[PDB]
Design a protein around this ligand. Structure first.
Ligand SMILES: Nc1ncnc2c1ncn2[C@@H]1O[C@H](COP(=O)(O)OP(=O)(O)O)[C@@H](O)[C@H]1O
Ligand code: BEF
Length: 182
């Protein structure tokens, strides 16, 4: 939540061409934002590059220029939460607020390997937000370096083809290639 208390599109000073184009693409996005269009952004790249930074920035910028309140979740944290109240039987209120949210950030989306019930929820949340035009921002890890449909096949390996296909329709892809990480 608030290790990025200071993550503004203003505190952001791009450190290369990649980070600069992302910033301009975000500013255009935040400016032209209709929650009824269900368009999001997808941030890909290595660790320390600033993906989560820009995702939190985008979430705030939307809220400070459009007044639309969204949510930031770590994907694993969101999944563990839900799986609990899924098999506790009595909290749907949290699930609806997540699914029906105008803006949702899925941070570190299934970066590693996931169990069947984790793949169940991810596919569920994304298909719902795909069908009901609910704008959703994603940050994800890309392994091998040098290859864009590989950002899709590498993602599809741990999420499935169906999901990555829908992620590609709704979102614009922004690769971030900073070096030296954090
Ligand atoms: N252009 C930038 N300006 C200021 N701080 C940055 C920038 N890029 C990254 N950071 C900081 O570096 C740290 C790691 O970045 P992070 O967003 O977590 O990268 P990733 O999510 O890709 O791992 C964060 O604390 C973030 O605030
Ligand atoms: F350290 Be990461 F790419 F959120």
């Amino acid at each position: 939540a608030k290790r990025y208390w200071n993550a503004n599109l203003d505190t952001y000073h791009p450190k290369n061409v990649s980070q600069n184009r992302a910033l301009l693409t975000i500013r255009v996005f935040v400016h032209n934002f209709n929650p009824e269009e269900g368009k999001g952004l997808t941030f890909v790249g290595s660790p320390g590059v600033g993906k989560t930074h820009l995702a939190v920035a985008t979430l705030k910028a939307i809220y400070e220029k459009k007044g639309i309140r969204g949510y930031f979740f770590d994907t694993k944290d969101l999944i563990f939460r839900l799986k609990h109240l899924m098999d506790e039987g009595k909290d749907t209120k949290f699930l609806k607020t997540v699914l029906n949210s105008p803006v949702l950030v899925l941070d570190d989306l299934g970066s590693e390997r996931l169990s069947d019930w984790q793949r169940e929820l991810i596919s569920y949340i994304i298909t719902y937000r795909y069908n009901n035009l609910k704008s959703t921002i994603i940050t994800t890890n890309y392994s091998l370096q040098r290859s864009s449909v590989r950002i899709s096949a590498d993602l599809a390996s741990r999420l499935g083809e169906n999901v990555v296909s829908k992620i590609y329709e709704m979102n614009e892809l922004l690769v971030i290639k900073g070096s030296d990480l954090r």
